[PDB]
Design a protein around this ligand. Structure first.
Ligand SMILES: O[C@@H]1[C@@H](O)[C@H](O[C@@H]2CO[C@@H](O[C@@H]3CO[C@@H](O[C@@H]4CO[C@@H](O)[C@H](O)[C@H]4O)[C@H](O)[C@H]3O)[C@H](O)[C@H]2O)OC[C@H]1O
Ligand SMILES: [Ca+2]
Ligand SMILES: [Ca+2]
Length: 165
């Protein structure tokens, strides 16, 4: 049981994602206009996948002004007021030196919590944290920020987002 939808990209056909807002069920991908060299978002079928058969790959070619100018946001995330949740996701990168922040917030852009400038390695690792829905929201969001300068020239892979009571 999880709060989010399509946490492992298994719903989505393999291929480059061109419809960023609606091409991946359960997710909203977004690239801001300050990112002059846009990234490539791809759902990959690979036996490397920690969950199922598929992962999301984000190839970063350039950045903008804020880390969220390249982001993948899980939406909707169905929760209950006052409840504490565990967030877990798996991530790795093509090259050394990647940086990602894993966040959760409300539709008002208020963050309930995050894992900040996580050090992503060339091997799959789990990244986990707890957060509490400290207000009266029931439908929240989980933005992952990839727009760090250190990621230029890298591909970041994510899989198996699970937000659990
Ligand atoms: O989808 C996008 C949303 O993600 C975005 O939300 C804003 C994201 O930035 C937020 O502010 C961040 C909060 O984290 C600060 O870093 C802290 C440093 O200390 C660490 O201990 C702690 O874990 C970190 O949280 C960072 O300085 C600051 O910039 C902001 O509050 C959110 O509103 O909004 C735009 C959406 O498109
Ligand atoms: Ca998967
Ligand atoms: Ca969407």
């Amino acid at each position: 049981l999880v709060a989010n939808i399509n946490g492992g990209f298994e719903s989505t056909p393999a291929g480059v994602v061109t419809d960023l807002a609606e091409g991946v069920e359960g997710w909203d991908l977004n690239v801001g206009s300050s990112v002059t060299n846009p990234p490539v978002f791809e759902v990959l079928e690979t036996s490397d996948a920690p969950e199922g058969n598929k992962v999301l790959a984000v190839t970063v070619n350039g950045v903008g002004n804020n880390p969220f100018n390249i982001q993948a946001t899980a939406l909707p995330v169905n929760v209950r007021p006052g409840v504490t949740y565990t967030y877990t996701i798996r991530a790795r990168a093509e090259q050394d030196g990647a940086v990602v922040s894993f966040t959760v917030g409300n539709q008002s852009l208020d963050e309930y919590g995050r894992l900040h400038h996580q050090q992503i390695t060339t091997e799959w690792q789990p990244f986990t944290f707890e957060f509490t829905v400290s207000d009266q929201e029931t439908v929240i969001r989980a933005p992952i920020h990839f727009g760090y300068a250190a990621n230029v020239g890298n591909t970041i892979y994510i899989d198996g987002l699970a937000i659990v009571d």
